[PDB]
């Protein structure tokens, strides 16, 4: 279909890696676990 029903309204907890959003703090931490493994390319790079 063509009905993009997003689910982002009250999410005071957003991931500082990708940009996800969660209702509670833990709800976010559990996600960050996926990023855990290697550091991205920030400083000293493009
Ligand atoms: Zn993330």
- Indicate the domain borders of the chain: 1-46
Domain 1-46 maps to which CATH number in 3.30.160.60, 3.40.640.10, 3.20.20.70, 3.40.50.300?
3.30.160.60
- Experimental method for this entry? NMR
14 CA to centre of ligand 1 in angstroms: 8
Residue 15: how many other CB atoms lie within 10 Å: 16
How far from each other are the two terminal CA atoms of the chain, in whole angstroms?
39
15 CA to centre of ligand 1 in angstroms: 5
38 CA to centre of ligand 1 in angstroms: 13
Among 44, 4, 11, 43, which residue's Cα sits nearest to residue 28? 11
Contacts of 40 (CB under 8 A, 6+ apart): 17
26 CA to centre of ligand 1 in angstroms: 13
Asked if 19 and 6 count as a contact pair (C-beta separation under 8 A), the reply is no
Tokens of residue 37, six digits: 């493994």
């Amino acid at each position: 279909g063509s009905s993009g029903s997003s689910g982002t309204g009250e999410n005071p907890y957003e991931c500082h890696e990708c940009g996800k959003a969660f209702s509670r703090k833990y709800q976010l931490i559990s996600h960050q676990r996926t990023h855990a493994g290697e550091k991205p390319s920030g400083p000293s790079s493009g």
